[PDB]
Amino acid sequence: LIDSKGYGVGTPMGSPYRDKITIAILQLQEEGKLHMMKEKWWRG
Amino acid sequence: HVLRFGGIFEYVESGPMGAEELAFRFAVNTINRNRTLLPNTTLTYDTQKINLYDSFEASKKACDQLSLGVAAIFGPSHSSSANAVQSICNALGVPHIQTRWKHQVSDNKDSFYVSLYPDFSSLSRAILDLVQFFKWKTVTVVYDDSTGLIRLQELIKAPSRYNLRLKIRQLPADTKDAKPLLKEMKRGKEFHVIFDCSHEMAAGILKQALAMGMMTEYYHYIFTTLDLFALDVEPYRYSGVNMTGFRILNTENTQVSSIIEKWSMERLQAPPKPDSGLLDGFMTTDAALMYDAVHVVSVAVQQFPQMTVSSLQCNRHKPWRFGTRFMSLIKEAHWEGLTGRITFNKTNGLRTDFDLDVISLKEEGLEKIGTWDPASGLNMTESQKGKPANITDSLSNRSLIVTTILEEPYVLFKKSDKPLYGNDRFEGYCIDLLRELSTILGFTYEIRLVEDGKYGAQDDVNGQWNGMVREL
């Protein structure tokens, strides 16, 4: 890995939904559904 | 004894009387019934109804009333007729009362007049203090009337002394053409708009902006009119719109609410327009201002027992023998009425010291958020309660546009024989993430593909972008 960049969501500048979508991604990351969604597509 | 009060009002062409004239007669009847003030004096009224901008008609009816004998003239609303009857009243020593604001030349030497509309210097300072509280940088000011730019002087003076960028736009002379103005608002990212119009024009502009999809949480509106609580806010209540306004009618009082409910019975005889986007039964600002005008003039009559009705002529200009003492008693009056504190300036005779109720729109409706005074400035009632963990039901009902790019297992094109249409046209990791986010927050969403087909990078030549970043 040359860099260590991150994949977020594309929100407009000064969006009202961005803090709510940030804590939504945090709550989804705590429940482990992100790991299941990662493990449902990257195989072959 | 008896005492005649003369009122010039707008002539309705067909139908019921106006709100100002009805509030004038209701004020006269309410003073003439309750013996709290002036027990030994009963007041009578004479009303003359004129058209718009006919100051010759206004001067003729004022001369007819002064030939009849009037202690104090409650003048008209529009500016030229108000200035004409102001010159009539100052010429003969008769007191003059203003309800609506008018523009006065500063070199005018007339002094036989008072006004109860708040001065727009103080209102402009209140709007500037609200803007400085909200920490804005780019403000779009929309004004309706060409004389309305005088009402927003200090906002225009503000970029000289502060850091601010104004974009001033005029409404069209046609009433229903707010759609190209709001189309101009959508370009250029106009987000913080200060509107300066009547509340009927505000209702029409809010309808035309709801139809154009500008009732989002991005925009913030400040209305300079003093009757935003009378506005129907039922479709705009759950839209999450940042909206702030001013109130002068302190409706939380018991006497104010009882007077409002008594006057609503007289209002329901007049048929209103129920499809105009106006909330029913709420008194306007000028009706309560005329009620407080009759009340404070009766207060000034109460401290003068030598008040006699004397007729005067217009062909000669003999001054009135009771003009100076009664005008000094009017200007030194002070009363708590429907607009709260009522006092006058010793120099201009304009209402410049008052109270303002800074209100705003939330998800439950309109609610008071602060108090403004010319001495204390702004005073915001602080609200930070916390506990934000109800985000599952937050973003419950907002249509949302999601833009992806048709590559990678994040956004995979669905492969099936039947050509379905909708949000389930795609699969992959990002569609699963969108399904999980719509499971959590609950927002209605749609997926439209990016027509550029690029991720997005800054073009170093022109400074522009492309793809998802420019589309955002």
Added chain:
Amino acid sequence: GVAAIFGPSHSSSANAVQSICNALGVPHIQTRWKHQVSDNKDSFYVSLYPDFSSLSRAILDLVQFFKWKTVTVVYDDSTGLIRLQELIKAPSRYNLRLKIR
């Protein structure tokens, strides 16, 4: 028995004389500019002072010829804000910044 009225210069007196001449059907002549109510029903008057919308468009044309970016506008009375509204609303049409004193 006059045939026409050459009225005064101050705006309130000219408005009163204009309403009198409109009611009596007499021609009224104005020589100084007054701010006009946008929905007046008056049609019995003329004014030979040049209209400030056209003069403000001439001002904006001169500004665009001189190729300016920051412009300080200074007036004397309140009615000058009515007298220069075309120059005032000329931002967000061109790349012009206004500071108004």
